Amino acid sequence: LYFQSNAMAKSRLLLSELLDQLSFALCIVRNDYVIVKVNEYFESRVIGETMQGKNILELFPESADYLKRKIDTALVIESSSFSSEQKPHLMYQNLEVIPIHSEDGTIEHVCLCVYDV
Amino acid sequence: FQSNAMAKSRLLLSELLDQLSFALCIVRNDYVIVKVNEYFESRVIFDGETMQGKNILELFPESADYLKRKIDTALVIESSSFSSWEQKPHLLPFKQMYQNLEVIPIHSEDGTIEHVCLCVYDVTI
Amino acid sequence: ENLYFQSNAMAKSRLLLSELLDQLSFALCIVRNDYVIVKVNEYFESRVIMQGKNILELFPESADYLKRKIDTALVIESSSFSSEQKPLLPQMYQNLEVIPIHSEDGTIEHVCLCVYDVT
Amino acid sequence: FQSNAMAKSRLLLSELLDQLSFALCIVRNDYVIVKVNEYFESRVIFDGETMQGKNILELFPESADYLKRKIDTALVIESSSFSSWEQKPHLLPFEQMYQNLEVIPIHSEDGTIEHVCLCVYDVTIQ
């Protein structure tokens, strides 16, 4: 580590570890279950043409029951959820669902985050 | 209220990680791959498992010429180098834009370069 | 952010890294049953005016709240993510996280403390 | 138990951020400070509010000579530079350790270099 090159490498390595640790899947779903926004991370690590602008329940029917509920919950109770095996075609995965309030106060969107464990 | 706060937070975090992500690979003197990061794995047809202990020149022959010169430069002048990617066959896909390549020598206890570190970055203009 | 020149890209890259670290930055120390501090963040030390001191002796106004939260974790043997604090450590909220540390035997000799900021 | 998984996790993260953190400062081409890290503030006598709209060369006079040569290099050769901090008085106050300095020019739409970025990195040997 006496050479500046080594220091440089260390940094790059550490940043790579930090980034790979915080890496998570993210998309935003409209209240008709369509995706208005997604991670390069989600798109590059799961399951046609592109995820942007289509149905989540139809993209992952293997967990469409589980998903509908977790989304439906958010927009009705209007709060975040946090769930505990595997819930996507990517020990397991954790899911987080945040409702997004419009300026009037109505939810028309939820944020979906899946974390690898 | 607190919901948009959480949402905006996850959104921001996500957007920084997407913009800071880069490919990283470590190779021996013989151009044998010893380490690779998740971003690298996901942008080549190969898994990191098969790539372990393979020669990067052999694994990517369309970029071998360019890559060898770049690695060899770092081995001989004994210092890191940073530049955009000169040669038309890119090692990695992009997903007008371009790619920077960084090459960093790793010195042994004795002083000699025994590994070198490659990082590829993606820029959109 | 006129990223056509390569120097501009590097500067963007650094500013972004800086932004991320600012975001993730938090205060961490580790105390034992004595309430003595045996480990602490550079972040923590650079943000309050430390190793070997008593966490309660250091922050007098908060001492009441701090003891509770520490002693909770070790009795439940589980974690305590919480906000509530009035008299916390140097509105703009500060969330607190306490995590027990099971020693080789199984009994808890330490807890981790984490304080976070929010805009 | 699960408790140790969380602790080690926070410790890991915490030690990663300690090692990746660096001081960052943007200066106009007349040496006037435009933007600065929280991490930079914490390690100088000044605070961010006070520093903004002031000349770096005036704020750290014992370092001005070295800093001007570094910033001017960027300004004239139109390129970034990276080296250890070579002058005896270090800008920032942090088993021997040493500091690295990176100067990066920033081009305007026109082409002209109107700001430069400064980043000070801390290394630790042995």
Residue A76 one-letter amino acid:
V
Q: CB A113 to CB B21 under 8 A?
A: no
Q: How far is CA B54 from CA B25, B58, B93, C110, in A?
A: 12, 8, 20, 45
User: Residue A117's closest chain D neighbor by CA?
Assistant: D5
Q: Cα B11 vs. chain centroid, distance in angstroms?
A: 26
Residue B61 burial (C-beta neighbours within 10 Å; 0-12, 13-18, 19+): exposed
Question: What would the two tokens of residue D11 be?
Answer: 């410790």
* β-sheet bridge partners, residue D33: D27
Within 8 A of D17 by CB-CB distance, chain A residues are 18
Q: Which of B3, B28, B37 to mutate to test the interface with A (most CBs of A within 10 A)?
A: B3
What's the gap in Å between the CA of D23 and the closest CA on chain A?
14
* B121 touches C13 (CB < 8 A): yes
The residue among C98, C94, C57, C93 whose CA lies nearest residue C76 is C98
Q: CB B19 to CB C19 under 8 A?
A: no
% helix / strand / coil in chain D, to the nearest 5? Answer: 40, 30, 30
Within 8 A of D39 by CB-CB distance, chain C residues are 18, 21-22
% helix / strand / coil in chain C, to the nearest 5? Answer: 35, 25, 40
Return the CATH number at A43. 3.30.450.20
DSSP string covering B4-58: HHHHHHHHHHHHHHHHH--EEEEEETT-BEEEE-HHHHTTSSS-HHHHTT-BHHH
Cα B51 to Cα B34: distance, rounded to the nearest angstrom: 8
Eight-class DSSP state of D46: S
User: Residue D11's closest chain C neighbor by CA?
Assistant: C28
Which residue range is the domain that position B86 belongs to? Answer: 1-125
Helix (H, G, I), strand (E, B) or coil at D80: coil
Question: What would the two tokens of residue A90 be?
Answer: 């990517």
Name the domain count of chain A.
1
DSSP string covering B57-109: HHH-TTTHHHHHHHHHHHHHHTS-EEEE--SSS-SS----EEEEEEEEEEE-T
Reported in sequence order, the residue ranges of chain D that DSSP labels E, i.e. its strands, are 23-28, 33-36, 81-84, 97-107, 113-124
Given CB atoms, is A21 within the 8 Å cutoff of chain D? yes
Question: What would the two tokens of residue C14 be?
Answer: 């650094």
3-state helix/strand/coil string of A20-79:
HHHCCEEEEEECCCEEEEECHHHHHHCCCCCCCCCEHHHHCHHHHHHHHHHHHHHHHHHC
Determination approach: X-ray
Within 8 A of B124 by CB-CB distance, chain C residues are 3
Given CB atoms, is D124 within the 8 Å cutoff of chain A? yes
A55 dihedral zone (left: phi>0; alpha: psi -120 to 50; beta):
beta
Q: CB C16 to CB B13 under 8 A?
A: no
Give the pairing type, strands C27-32 and C37-40. antiparallel
Subunit partners of chain C (3 or more CB pairs within 8 A): B, D
Given CB atoms, is D77 within the 8 Å cutoff of chain C? no
**Residues closing a segment before a gap in chain C (C–N exceeding 2.5 Å):** 49, 83, 87, 90
Give the pairing type, strands B113-124 and C27-32. unpaired
HSE-CB of A45 using CA atoms within 13 angstroms:
19
Within 8 A of A15 by CB-CB distance, chain D residues are 20
Question: What would the two tokens of residue C42 be?
Answer: 């550079």
Q: Cα C2 vs. chain centroid, distance in angstroms?
A: 38
Stated in angstroms to one decimal place, the resolution of this structure is 2.8
- Alpha-carbon torsion D80, D86, D90, D93, what sign? positive
The dihedral formed by the CA atoms of A60, A65, A66 and A67, expressed in degrees to the nearest 10: 60
Q: CB C13 to CB B124 under 8 A?
A: no
Residue A94's contacts (CB-CB under 8 Å, 6 or more residues apart) are A82, A83, A84, A114, A115, A117
Q: CB D22 to CB C24 under 8 A?
A: no
Cα B63 to Cα B83: distance, rounded to the nearest angstrom: 16
Cα B105 to Cα B73: distance, rounded to the nearest angstrom: 10
Residue A30's contacts (CB-CB under 8 Å, 6 or more residues apart) are A36, A108, A109
Cα A44 to Cα D42: distance, rounded to the nearest angstrom: 39
* C14 touches D104 (CB < 8 A): yes
Cα B22 to Cα A12: distance, rounded to the nearest angstrom: 10
Given CB atoms, is C3 within the 8 Å cutoff of chain B? yes
Question: What would the two tokens of residue C30 be?
Answer: 């580790």
What's the gap in Å between the CA of B78 and the closest CA on chain A?
9
* C114 touches C81 (CB < 8 A): no
Phi and psi at residue A109, to the nearest 5°? -145, 145
Within 8 A of D106 by CB-CB distance, chain C residues are 7-8, 11
Eight-class DSSP state of B121: E
Given CB atoms, is D124 within the 8 Å cutoff of chain C? no
* D54 touches D28 (CB < 8 A): no
User: Residue D105's closest chain C neighbor by CA?
Assistant: C7
Cα D13 to Cα D16: distance, rounded to the nearest angstrom: 5
* A48 touches D50 (CB < 8 A): no
A83 dihedral zone (left: phi>0; alpha: psi -120 to 50; beta):
beta
Residue A84 burial (C-beta neighbours within 10 Å; 0-12, 13-18, 19+): exposed
Cα C58 to Cα C90: distance, rounded to the nearest angstrom: 11
Q: CB D13 to CB C24 under 8 A?
A: yes
Given CB atoms, is B24 within the 8 Å cutoff of chain A? yes
Cα D118 to Cα D120: distance, rounded to the nearest angstrom: 7
Q: CB B20 to CB C4 under 8 A?
A: no
The residue among C41, C40, C63, C62 whose CA lies nearest residue C51 is C40
Cα B58 to Cα B51: distance, rounded to the nearest angstrom: 11
Q: CB B20 to CB C16 under 8 A?
A: yes
Q: Residue B24: which of A16, A23, A24 has the nearest Cβ?
A: A16
Cα D16 to Cα B17: distance, rounded to the nearest angstrom: 15
* B69 touches B107 (CB < 8 A): no
Within 8 A of D82 by CB-CB distance, chain A residues are 4, 8
Cα C75 to Cα A98: distance, rounded to the nearest angstrom: 32
Phi and psi at residue A72, to the nearest 5°? -50, -40
Residue D80's contacts (CB-CB under 8 Å, 6 or more residues apart) are C7, C10, D74, D102, D103, D104, D105
Q: Cα A74 vs. chain centroid, distance in angstroms?
A: 15
Question: What would the two tokens of residue B37 be?
Answer: 């990061």
Give the pairing type, strands C94-102 and C108-117. antiparallel
Q: CB B20 to CB C3 under 8 A?
A: no
Residue C39 burial (C-beta neighbours within 10 Å; 0-12, 13-18, 19+): middle
